[PDB]
Every structure is written in structure tokens, then in C-alpha cells.
Amino acid sequence: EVQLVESGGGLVQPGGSLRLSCAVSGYSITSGYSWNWIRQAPGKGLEWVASITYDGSTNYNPSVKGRITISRDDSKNTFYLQMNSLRAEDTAVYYCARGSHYFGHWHFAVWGQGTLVTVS
Amino acid sequence: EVQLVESGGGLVQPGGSLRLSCAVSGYSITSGYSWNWIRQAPGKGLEWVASITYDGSTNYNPSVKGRITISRDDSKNTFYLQMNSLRAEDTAVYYCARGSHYFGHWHFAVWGQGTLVTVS
Amino acid sequence: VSAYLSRPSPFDLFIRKSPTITCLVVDLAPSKGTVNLTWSRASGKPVNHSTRKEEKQRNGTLTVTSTLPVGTRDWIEGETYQCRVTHPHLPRALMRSTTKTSGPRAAPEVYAFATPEWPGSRDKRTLACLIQNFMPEDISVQWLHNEVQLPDARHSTTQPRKTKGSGFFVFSRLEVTRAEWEQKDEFICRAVHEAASPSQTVQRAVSV
Amino acid sequence: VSAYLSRPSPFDLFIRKSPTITCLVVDLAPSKGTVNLTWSRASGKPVNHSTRKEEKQRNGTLTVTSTLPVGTRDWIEGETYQCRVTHPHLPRALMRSTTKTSGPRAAPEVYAFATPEWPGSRDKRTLACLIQNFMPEDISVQWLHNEVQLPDARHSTTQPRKTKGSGFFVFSRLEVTRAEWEQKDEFICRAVHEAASPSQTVQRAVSVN
Amino acid sequence: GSDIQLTQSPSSLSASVGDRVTITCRASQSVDYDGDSYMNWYQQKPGKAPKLLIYAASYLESGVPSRFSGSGSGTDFTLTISSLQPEDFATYYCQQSHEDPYTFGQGTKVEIK
Amino acid sequence: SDIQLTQSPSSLSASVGDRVTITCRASQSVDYDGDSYMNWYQQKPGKAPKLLIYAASYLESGVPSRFSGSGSGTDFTLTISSLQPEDFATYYCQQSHEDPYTFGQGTKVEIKGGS
Ligand SMILES: *[C@@H]1O[C@H](CO)[C@@H](O[C@@H]2O[C@H](CO)[C@@H](O[C@@H]3O[C@H](CO[C@H]4O[C@H](CO)[C@@H](O[C@@H]5O[C@H](CO)[C@@H](O)[C@H](O)[C@@H]5O)[C@H](O)[C@@H]4O)[C@@H](O)[C@H](O[C@H]4O[C@H](CO)[C@@H](O)[C@H](O)[C@@H]4O)[C@@H]3O)[C@H](O)[C@H]2NC(C)=O)[C@H](O)[C@H]1NC(C)=O
Ligand SMILES: *[C@@H]1O[C@H](CO)[C@@H](O[C@@H]2O[C@H](CO)[C@@H](O[C@@H]3O[C@H](CO[C@H]4O[C@H](CO)[C@@H](O)[C@H](O)[C@@H]4O)[C@@H](O)[C@H](O)[C@@H]3O)[C@H](O)[C@H]2NC(C)=O)[C@H](O)[C@H]1NC(C)=O
Ligand SMILES: *[C@@H]1O[C@H](CO)[C@@H](O)[C@H](O)[C@H]1NC(C)=O
């Protein structure tokens, strides 16, 4: 069974930069599916942040384009969210999720427990 | 299984009389159903001639009432058509048929091969 | 509104010799004025006294059933019974008919056995019956506990389905008490069918 | 218009090792231009080369089938194949999905008997097979006369029903002729099921004598 | 002449195997009563006695091929052969059982072309 | 400049066995190719969402049949036919039609009384 675990949260300073990591086990992130980062500000809505397909195609939300970067590591079966110039508007819980494919459209069938990012 | 046989047909002279028989086998003509005579002029339509029920009721076609009689004979499981004063219009094929009952109305579900009556 | 007219069970026709046929009307709105459910026979002899029953339903639906006794000699001789539902609402009338289904006829073969005793069945044993190659489809399946006929509730049997060649077949599964296989270690699977000979009965015995 | 999406049989999947899934569209009249029916996998991996075929029946309806091959490993690893039919005469689309049935897995145990000869039919005998306690429910049953595979017509098998306990069961009847068992009195009732170990096969041998 | 007269059409027709044949009966007066219509349809092949096909306008006599169908009410009834067949070439009669004397239509011959 | 999803109601209370109906309205149509790309998620507090329905009306595997989805264009509805104790959660719709993918704000389904 596919399992996903976020790491890299903590108390962080504004304007700095942080790397979140999603450690996937039980399925290979180059064998299929889309790999997403979705965040949730406290008691607010879910926001889709960025994705990478198994074949390497990347997609971003315009709300974070430029200051956020998504990469993977075939060797470590992990993928990463690089965030620069952190703002208060970035404080949230970041979930990583495995998207399942429906005729060119993706839905988020598997998530992980979440990691918290807080910006003073 | 309820088979019916006409008999007694033949060539007959005008103004005379003849009697046809329907030799019923496989069912008791007093046990149920309606027992009919139908005749058909060569290349003409079917004309219903006479009927007799298992209980003895008679019915005649008014076009021949008064010179046609229908009678039955329980022991020989046979029934008969009595005709006096034969005319040319009586020339036809005489069929006997077992009518089945539907909420007070009868349909002609079982027939016999017919016997021919020729006048003149 | 739908309407159904059943046949006699072979058992009612060839053993008890007290056959009946039921005319069942369903899907009625109780709002409507009551339905007329009259009978006719192909012979023209009059109809016995039929029994009427109304039973309102959990669907807001209403069920009226009519059962009519029928003559054994009359049915086998090739009689036709017809039910007619009319209503002041309904435009015309519904009619359903029944008869002895004419066709080729073959008597059933019967085999009984045990299913392998299996974990979770210390006091429970399971008995099965195969009945096949009969036609027409009309059949009555019976389990008997050594000269005592068993409640039909105790056994559940499958609907007749068509074989590859030409016969029908059914399955009867039966679980017998520890006491029952101990009180008597013999069980009888019997089928009643118009082709079966003699007395329209064929049966076998099988034990735990 | 209706659309049906079949799964690969255990036999096609473990013996022929050439599994395929068919998406069947039925009840359509030729009518307006033909229907478009495409595929998708849950993984997003691309779909093979699928073959389409159109057939006009006696009743005037159109049977359009699309056949797609699958990798046995892909299927067992738990892929999801999805078919989607679109038609101008239909406002929305029909979608059918198929995948490996989730749950516990128990291989089937098999029992075969012969029926005692019946009076009047000395030359036909009936052999029976009960297959039970397996899951999931997907199973393939085939009869062999000593390593000669018999046409699937020769036998009738019940659809799997769920027992009181935890397995499913099926019951298979095979009618064999006297000539067949006198030349060779060995008959094999064989089940192909994904839990059976090894090679996904369980069988019993049954003789008329 | 106060009887019920049944007029059929067509009198004669030509068809091919697989066609749909439709025959019509028109009665001098209504043969409806009690929510039913007492019109029966018979087939007569040459030199043989008639055979009953449909009774009560729309009910198929037992053992009658499914392609035969009847319909109608009032004074208008229709026999329909949905898919003509090689043996179905014959003359076809309607007969009313509502009011005595029972009367027959004049027949329609369906001929093979 | 994105697609907005408004859900209604915001918050609701029910009891076990009730029938609950939630509405999602998209700022513009999410239809293409005869399908509707609206997905429904369940989120219990302190836990991550769980996918229930994708493409408006299709059930994710292992999801109880009591969940059903329907709709087209910009009007979609999640229907729980028979509420259960475990069904008390916040529920999100999210459109997969056009980038960037967007979620509704959520409908909180709380048990009748006081949470
Ligand atoms: C006009 O005439 C045509 C021609 O006869 C009619 O076409 C038929 O139409 C019916 C009605 O829809 C249709 O019945 C459905 O059949 C589905 C297909 O399943 C059949 O075929 C498959 C493949 O051939 C079989 O499975 C295969 O098994 C093989 C090994 O075992 C394997 O190699 C293969 O890959 C498959 O696994 C299957 O056993 C069966 O033979 C059925 O799935 C379906 O039933 C399902 O759905 C209902 C619910 O909707 C359930 O209740 C049911 O239990 C089951 O789950 C349908 O019954 C039939 O396929 C079709 N045939 C053709 C050739 O077109 C047409 O219907 C007629 N229509 C009119 C208006 O006249
Ligand atoms: C209202 O409440 C009622 C609850 O009692 C519901 O009534 C049930 O209605 C169904 C009809 O859908 C009856 O079901 C069966 O009908 C089948 C038909 O299948 C085959 O039957 C013959 C048998 O030879 C076969 O020739 C046909 O071709 C069919 O394939 C039959 O197997 C039975 O006759 C049986 O009647 C139920 O019996 C009936 N229940 C009761 C208790 O009477 C009803 O659905 C509810 N809803 C409505 C809208 O009325
Ligand atoms: C049904 O028809 C018979 C025949 O006259 C009659 O007894 C009955 O009253 C009719 N209608 C009803 C509603 O019973």
C-alpha cells in the first residue's frame, strides 16, 4: 500500500526559505500518478500548490509561481517543495498527496498526515 | 388430443335432406366446451351455422333457422347437423369445431378437416 | 399495475390432488375504487368460489390476491383458466392465462450427497440434492426425514434453469440437526413431476 | 444505450498469460455518426493500442466493442482501467471502470463426484464439482478429459454465491458419454483462481468407476 | 341483414419473406363490451381448415408464433405479422364473437412474391 | 482569475440516519467531454482529507454506497442517504477542470446537540 510522510516543518522566520520533503514508500514516484503539495491555512480552505507527474511534467499554482519550486529524487523515492521568501500568507499545514488519473484530470486519492509551517 | 372428424357429406339433390356427423375423440362433448358447425362456400367467406353446448343449449344462424337442426349423441361422442330442403347455396365445406370460452364469448380453437356438400 | 397468474404445484396436482392457481394483482393505489377480479374457464363450466384478499403494503402499494381451486382431471386434460382484472379507472382490462404447458416431457433424475464437513460445523452437517434433465419446468422438491415429510422452510432450493442440451435442473441445500442425523441417519430427496413414474415421484436417500 | 466493462478471466490472466478487457456498447441504432469510446488508466500511464469493431445485429442494434490488452503484472499490482463512451445523442458520458477485486484471498478447495448410473440412461453419466471457500469471487472452471481440454460448452457452472462462512462457492456439472470414459476414465475438474498456489490452479480427478 | 358485417383490407396483397404485413378489420357496429373487444383472427391455408391465432382482439392462442400480434378496439382491429415467413402465406379471417350470429370477415390472401 | 467554488450550506446539524444534501457552485462551468470534474472530499479534524467522489458521480473505491454525487455545469450536490456516526466531518468540493485546481471552503457537518 502507498504510504506518504511529510517532513520539514517547524517554526520559521519571514523572508527565509524552507524545503519540505515527502518520503514515499510502497509505490515508485516514477512508475505512475501525480505527486502534489496541498496546503491548508488554519481553519481555512485547502489550496493546491504544486504537482509533478510520474513522467516529470510540472505544474504550479500562479499564486506561488516564482517563489516555490517542486523537484524529486528518483534515488530516494522522495519529492520536495522549495519555498523562498516565506510570508505570513504561507503559514499552513502542507499535505502531500498522490493524484489518480482520469482522462487527463487528476484527483487526490492518497494523502499524508501533514506537516506544519509557521512564519512569525 | 381432441380430434374431430366430419362425415356424412357427399353429393345431394335439391329439396332433399342430409345429416352430417362430427365424431369427437379425446374429450367428452358433454364434459365441456361448445360444439359448432361452420361451412364455407367454394371461394366464399366462412359462415357460422350452428352450435350446441355441453349442457344442451342450442344456437342457430337465423339465415338457416327453421330448416337446420343440431343434435347430439352422448354414447357415440358424436354430434350432427340436420338439414332439410337443400338448396344450391348450401353447397360448401362443412367444418366442425370446438369453441373455447372467454367470459361468456366463444372462439374456435380446434377444427376438423372438413367434409364437402355439393348440390345439383 | 402488474398482474400474475400461477400454475398448480406438481405436488398439489399428483399427491394431495387438491390443486389451486392464484391470480395476484400488485401496484394499486388504495385511492382508486376497488378492482374487479373475475374468472373464466376455457370449458365454459362455471367457476368455483374464488377467495379474495387485500393486504396493504409498505410501499403505499396494495395487493389483492385471488385463489381458485381447479379440477385435477380438468387441468391435466388440457384446460385453460383465465383471470380478468378490471377497474373503473383502468381503460381496458388485464387478462392473464394458464395451461398445462404443452411440449415434450422428461422425468427428473435425482442424486443426494453431503458437502464436506467443514470448520464451524460441529453440530451442523450440510446435505445437497441435484435434480436434472426434466421437462417441463414445473417441479416440486421435497426433503423427508425417514417417512416424515420435513417443513419446506428447512430447505431452500434454486430456481429451474435450462441445461446445455434440453433438461432443467435445480439444487436443494439442507442442513440437518445433530439430533436429526442421530435420530435417523437417512434423508430423502424427492421430486414430483408429471413425467415421473409412477405416481409422478422419483426419490433417493443420502446419509451423514 | 448501455455499456459494459468486463474483467479479465482468471484463465486468460494466469494460463494464456494474454489478458484483455472489453468495453461493450449495445442497444444502439446506426443512427447519427458512430460513438467514440476512449480509455484511461488510474496510474496515468498511457493506454496500449486498442482495437475497435462494429457489428449490426438481427434486432437492428449496433454492438460496438473495444478490446484493450493488459499486463498481468499491471492488473495484479492493482491498476484501474476505465472506459468512457460518448455519443451526440447522449448528453453526458457513460463510464465503466474495472480493477482487481479487493479483500482477503483464499484459494479454492475442490471436490468431484460421479453420479450413480440412472435407469434408462446407461450411456450418459454426470460428474459434479463443488468449489468453495475461495476469494475474491473471480474464478475460472474448465473440464479436461485426461489432458484434453473440453469446450466450455460441455459444462455448466453456477455463478459464485457467498457462503455462510468466508469463502464463495461454485458448482459445476459435466455430462460425459460412455464412449468417452471407456476410452479413458479420468476426468479433471480444474479451477483457476488468483490465490491458488502455485500456478493459480487447483483440480481433482474423478472417474466413472 | 341486422348482423354484424366485417370488412377486411386489403383483400389481396404480395409480400416477401421478412416484411411486415398489416391486415385490417372494420365492423358494422362496436364489438366492445366489459373492457374487452371480441374479435378473433384465423389463418387458413388452402385445402385445410382454419387455425385460430388471436382471440379477444389481442391475445395470442397457445402455440402461436410470437410474430403474430393483434390490436384494436371499437370497430377497428389489426392483425400484424411483424416478420413474414415462408409458411405464413395464406388467407386470414377476422371473426367477431360479440353478438349472434357470429360473423366472419371476407378474408385477406397474403401471397408470396 | 481562477475558478471559485461556493458551497452551501456552510454548516449544518443532523442526527444518525438522516439524509443530508450539500451544494457546490462553481464560478464557471467545469464540464468538458460529457463529464463534470467536481470531486468531493471528507476531512475529520486533525486528519487529512479522504476522497469520496470524483468526476461528480463516481465513487472512490471502498467508499460506502450511501455517498452519492450528482450535478453538471456549475451546480453540484453531494448526498448522504443515511448519516452514520463516523460521517461527521467537514466536506469539500474541488474542481479538476482547469488550472489551478481549486477547492470550495467546506461544509461542516456536526451532530445535533453541541460539539
Ligand atoms: C439485440 O441483439 C444483440 C445480439 O444478441 C444483443 O446484444 C446483447 O445485449 C445484451 C443486453 O445488454 C448484452 O447483455 C449484457 O452482456 C454483458 C456482457 O457479458 C457477456 O459477454 C462477456 C464477454 O463476451 C462475458 O464475460 C467474458 O468472460 C470471458 C471468459 O469467461 C472473458 O474472456 C471476457 O473478457 C469476459 O470476461 C459474460 O459472461 C457475458 O457472456 C453482461 O456483462 C451484462 O450483464 C451484467 O450487468 C447486469 C446489470 O446491468 C447484471 O445484472 C448481470 O449479472 C451482469 O453483471 C448484460 O447482460 C449482451 O452482452 C449483448 N451481446 C452482444 C453480442 O452484443 C442486444 O442486447 C439486443 N438488443 C435489442 C434492443 O434488441
Ligand atoms: C408495493 O409493495 C409490494 C410488497 O409486497 C411489492 O410487491 C411485489 O411486486 C413484485 C413485482 O415486481 C412481485 O414479484 C414477483 O414477480 C415476479 C416476476 O418475475 C417472473 O415471474 C413469472 C413467473 O412465471 C415469469 O413468467 C415472468 O416472466 C417474470 O420473469 C415473479 O417471480 C412472481 O410472480 C412475484 O410475484 C412480488 O411478489 C410482490 N410482493 C408481494 C408480497 O406480493 C411492490 O413492488 C411494491 N411497490 C409497488 C410500486 O407496488
Ligand atoms: C365485476 O363484474 C361482475 C359481473 O357483473 C360484478 O359482479 C361486479 O360487481 C363487477 N364489479 C365490481 C367492482 O365488483
Tab-separated table of C-alpha atoms in Angstrom, chain C residues 5-205:
chain	number	residue	atom	x	y	z
C	5	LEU	CA	-51.369	-15.934	-12.630
C	6	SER	CA	-49.573	-19.023	-11.270
C	7	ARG	CA	-49.813	-22.775	-12.034
C	8	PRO	CA	-50.590	-25.718	-9.703
C	9	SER	CA	-47.598	-27.145	-7.889
C	10	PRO	CA	-46.886	-30.689	-9.105
C	11	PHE	CA	-47.307	-31.767	-5.509
C	12	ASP	CA	-50.805	-30.251	-5.303
C	13	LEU	CA	-51.683	-31.994	-8.556
C	14	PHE	CA	-50.249	-35.509	-8.196
C	15	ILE	CA	-50.025	-36.243	-4.455
C	16	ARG	CA	-52.535	-34.113	-2.486
C	17	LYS	CA	-54.770	-33.917	-5.593
C	18	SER	CA	-56.128	-30.553	-4.383
C	19	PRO	CA	-54.632	-28.117	-6.908
C	20	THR	CA	-55.080	-24.372	-6.885
C	21	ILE	CA	-53.951	-21.417	-9.012
C	22	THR	CA	-53.506	-17.840	-7.731
C	23	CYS	CA	-54.116	-14.536	-9.536
C	24	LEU	CA	-52.085	-11.727	-7.982
C	25	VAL	CA	-52.550	-8.024	-8.725
C	26	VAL	CA	-49.956	-5.533	-7.485
C	27	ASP	CA	-49.065	-1.837	-7.670
C	28	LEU	CA	-52.519	-0.475	-6.835
C	29	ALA	CA	-53.085	2.928	-5.306
C	30	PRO	CA	-55.611	2.381	-2.474
C	31	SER	CA	-57.098	5.725	-3.535
C	32	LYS	CA	-58.694	4.033	-6.525
C	33	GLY	CA	-62.009	2.232	-6.339
C	34	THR	CA	-61.663	-1.459	-5.762
C	35	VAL	CA	-60.588	-3.732	-8.656
C	36	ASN	CA	-62.826	-6.334	-10.253
C	37	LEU	CA	-61.123	-9.718	-10.403
C	38	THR	CA	-63.328	-12.220	-12.224
C	39	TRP	CA	-62.644	-15.659	-13.693
C	40	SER	CA	-63.278	-17.694	-16.814
C	41	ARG	CA	-62.533	-21.246	-17.864
C	42	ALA	CA	-61.903	-22.446	-21.377
C	43	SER	CA	-64.558	-25.175	-20.919
C	44	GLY	CA	-67.404	-22.787	-20.110
C	45	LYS	CA	-68.262	-24.691	-16.957
C	46	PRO	CA	-68.733	-22.128	-14.183
C	47	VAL	CA	-66.041	-21.088	-11.744
C	48	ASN	CA	-65.724	-22.386	-8.216
C	49	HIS	CA	-65.895	-19.853	-5.440
C	50	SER	CA	-62.681	-17.855	-5.532
C	51	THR	CA	-61.080	-16.309	-2.463
C	52	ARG	CA	-60.294	-12.613	-2.348
C	53	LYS	CA	-57.748	-10.946	-0.090
C	54	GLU	CA	-56.449	-7.398	0.227
C	55	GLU	CA	-53.257	-6.535	2.053
C	56	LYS	CA	-51.850	-3.021	2.077
C	57	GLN	CA	-48.103	-2.748	1.685
C	58	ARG	CA	-45.048	-0.872	2.941
C	59	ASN	CA	-44.737	0.812	-0.482
C	60	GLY	CA	-48.087	2.517	-0.107
C	61	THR	CA	-48.840	-0.258	-2.597
C	62	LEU	CA	-51.902	-2.551	-2.307
C	63	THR	CA	-52.045	-6.310	-3.010
C	64	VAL	CA	-55.243	-8.171	-3.935
C	65	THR	CA	-54.847	-11.913	-4.449
C	66	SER	CA	-57.449	-14.404	-5.676
C	67	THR	CA	-57.068	-18.168	-5.345
C	68	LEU	CA	-59.263	-20.573	-7.272
C	69	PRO	CA	-59.388	-24.349	-6.811
C	70	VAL	CA	-59.139	-26.281	-10.065
C	71	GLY	CA	-60.021	-29.784	-11.142
C	72	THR	CA	-57.110	-32.191	-11.370
C	73	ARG	CA	-58.680	-34.186	-14.192
C	74	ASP	CA	-59.656	-30.885	-15.796
C	75	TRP	CA	-56.137	-29.385	-15.663
C	76	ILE	CA	-54.251	-32.425	-16.976
C	77	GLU	CA	-56.862	-32.898	-19.697
C	78	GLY	CA	-55.766	-29.553	-21.145
C	79	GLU	CA	-57.959	-26.931	-19.530
C	80	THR	CA	-57.356	-23.181	-19.646
C	81	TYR	CA	-58.096	-20.825	-16.742
C	82	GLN	CA	-58.140	-17.051	-17.177
C	83	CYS	CA	-58.186	-14.210	-14.651
C	84	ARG	CA	-59.501	-10.753	-15.519
C	85	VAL	CA	-58.759	-7.553	-13.597
C	86	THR	CA	-60.942	-4.581	-14.376
C	87	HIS	CA	-61.183	-1.248	-12.662
C	88	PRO	CA	-63.402	1.790	-13.209
C	89	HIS	CA	-60.047	3.616	-13.553
C	90	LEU	CA	-58.152	1.285	-15.930
C	91	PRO	CA	-59.160	1.913	-19.583
C	92	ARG	CA	-59.488	-1.709	-20.717
C	93	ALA	CA	-58.808	-4.853	-18.662
C	94	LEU	CA	-55.845	-7.053	-17.801
C	95	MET	CA	-56.014	-10.770	-18.537
C	96	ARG	CA	-53.587	-13.498	-17.583
C	97	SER	CA	-53.990	-17.130	-18.654
C	98	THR	CA	-52.641	-20.533	-17.566
C	99	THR	CA	-52.439	-24.069	-19.063
C	100	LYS	CA	-50.515	-27.339	-18.793
C	101	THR	CA	-47.634	-26.050	-20.966
C	102	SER	CA	-47.718	-28.492	-23.881
C	103	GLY	CA	-44.421	-29.830	-25.126
C	104	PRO	CA	-42.055	-32.774	-24.833
C	105	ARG	CA	-41.789	-34.147	-21.317
C	106	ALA	CA	-38.933	-35.917	-19.496
C	107	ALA	CA	-38.918	-37.239	-15.899
C	108	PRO	CA	-36.260	-35.980	-13.443
C	109	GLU	CA	-33.129	-37.749	-12.162
C	110	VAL	CA	-32.097	-37.221	-8.527
C	111	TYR	CA	-28.834	-37.526	-6.571
C	112	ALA	CA	-28.056	-36.623	-2.996
C	113	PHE	CA	-24.787	-36.348	-1.145
C	114	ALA	CA	-23.094	-34.485	1.689
C	115	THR	CA	-20.989	-31.388	1.438
C	116	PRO	CA	-17.634	-31.943	3.123
C	117	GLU	CA	-17.933	-31.268	6.833
C	118	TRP	CA	-16.099	-28.016	7.337
C	119	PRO	CA	-14.729	-25.851	10.168
C	120	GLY	CA	-17.531	-24.107	12.050
C	121	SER	CA	-19.998	-27.037	11.702
C	122	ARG	CA	-19.597	-29.148	14.867
C	123	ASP	CA	-23.337	-29.887	15.221
C	124	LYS	CA	-24.275	-28.822	11.707
C	125	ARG	CA	-23.957	-31.001	8.624
C	126	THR	CA	-24.965	-29.945	5.135
C	127	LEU	CA	-26.853	-32.050	2.578
C	128	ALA	CA	-27.324	-31.331	-1.095
C	129	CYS	CA	-29.509	-32.597	-3.909
C	130	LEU	CA	-29.147	-32.392	-7.700
C	131	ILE	CA	-32.291	-32.790	-9.857
C	132	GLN	CA	-31.819	-32.549	-13.592
C	133	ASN	CA	-32.913	-33.353	-17.128
C	134	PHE	CA	-36.623	-32.908	-16.559
C	135	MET	CA	-39.200	-31.044	-18.581
C	136	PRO	CA	-41.412	-29.158	-18.472
C	137	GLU	CA	-40.021	-26.828	-15.745
C	138	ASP	CA	-42.845	-27.463	-13.287
C	139	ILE	CA	-41.318	-29.326	-10.347
C	140	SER	CA	-41.782	-29.735	-6.568
C	141	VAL	CA	-38.791	-30.570	-4.393
C	142	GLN	CA	-39.198	-32.421	-1.130
C	143	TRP	CA	-36.944	-33.387	1.749
C	144	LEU	CA	-38.298	-36.062	4.096
C	145	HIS	CA	-36.907	-37.250	7.443
C	146	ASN	CA	-37.322	-41.007	7.093
C	147	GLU	CA	-41.075	-41.446	6.383
C	148	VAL	CA	-41.756	-37.975	7.845
C	149	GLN	CA	-42.005	-35.078	5.419
C	150	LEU	CA	-39.876	-32.131	6.588
C	151	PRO	CA	-41.004	-28.495	6.781
C	152	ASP	CA	-40.402	-26.767	3.457
C	153	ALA	CA	-38.838	-23.967	5.500
C	154	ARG	CA	-35.876	-26.199	6.413
C	155	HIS	CA	-34.643	-26.309	2.820
C	156	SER	CA	-34.001	-23.668	0.185
C	157	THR	CA	-33.863	-24.722	-3.466
C	158	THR	CA	-32.769	-22.881	-6.619
C	159	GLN	CA	-34.990	-21.782	-9.499
C	160	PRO	CA	-35.168	-24.126	-12.516
C	161	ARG	CA	-32.633	-23.185	-15.175
C	162	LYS	CA	-32.039	-24.582	-18.670
C	163	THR	CA	-29.357	-27.200	-19.338
C	164	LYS	CA	-26.950	-27.158	-22.261
C	165	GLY	CA	-28.876	-29.939	-24.033
C	166	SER	CA	-32.548	-29.944	-23.168
C	167	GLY	CA	-33.334	-30.735	-19.492
C	168	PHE	CA	-33.897	-28.477	-16.459
C	169	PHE	CA	-32.061	-28.569	-13.152
C	170	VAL	CA	-32.338	-27.324	-9.564
C	171	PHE	CA	-30.294	-27.501	-6.336
C	172	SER	CA	-31.641	-28.209	-2.843
C	173	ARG	CA	-29.376	-27.402	0.104
C	174	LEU	CA	-30.345	-28.732	3.518
C	175	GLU	CA	-28.706	-28.549	6.948
C	176	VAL	CA	-29.817	-31.294	9.354
C	177	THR	CA	-29.725	-31.118	13.159
C	178	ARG	CA	-27.204	-33.154	15.081
C	179	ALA	CA	-30.296	-34.653	16.702
C	180	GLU	CA	-31.835	-35.217	13.270
C	181	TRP	CA	-28.942	-37.215	11.796
C	182	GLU	CA	-28.726	-39.012	15.184
C	183	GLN	CA	-32.487	-39.687	15.493
C	184	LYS	CA	-32.263	-41.128	11.967
C	185	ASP	CA	-29.173	-41.171	9.719
C	186	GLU	CA	-31.204	-41.253	6.465
C	187	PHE	CA	-32.640	-38.317	4.465
C	188	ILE	CA	-34.734	-38.460	1.278
C	189	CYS	CA	-34.747	-36.001	-1.603
C	190	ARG	CA	-37.934	-36.442	-3.662
C	191	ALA	CA	-39.157	-34.653	-6.767
C	192	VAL	CA	-42.721	-34.537	-8.068
C	193	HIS	CA	-43.064	-34.054	-11.811
C	194	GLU	CA	-45.675	-35.015	-14.416
C	195	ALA	CA	-43.249	-37.250	-16.277
C	196	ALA	CA	-42.021	-39.056	-13.184
C	197	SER	CA	-43.173	-42.640	-12.975
C	198	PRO	CA	-45.011	-43.955	-11.171
C	199	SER	CA	-47.284	-41.630	-9.182
C	200	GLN	CA	-45.167	-38.774	-10.625
C	201	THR	CA	-42.487	-39.332	-7.980
C	202	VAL	CA	-38.767	-40.085	-8.021
C	203	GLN	CA	-36.599	-40.012	-4.904
C	204	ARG	CA	-33.242	-41.036	-3.421
C	205	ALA	CA	-31.736	-41.345	0.068
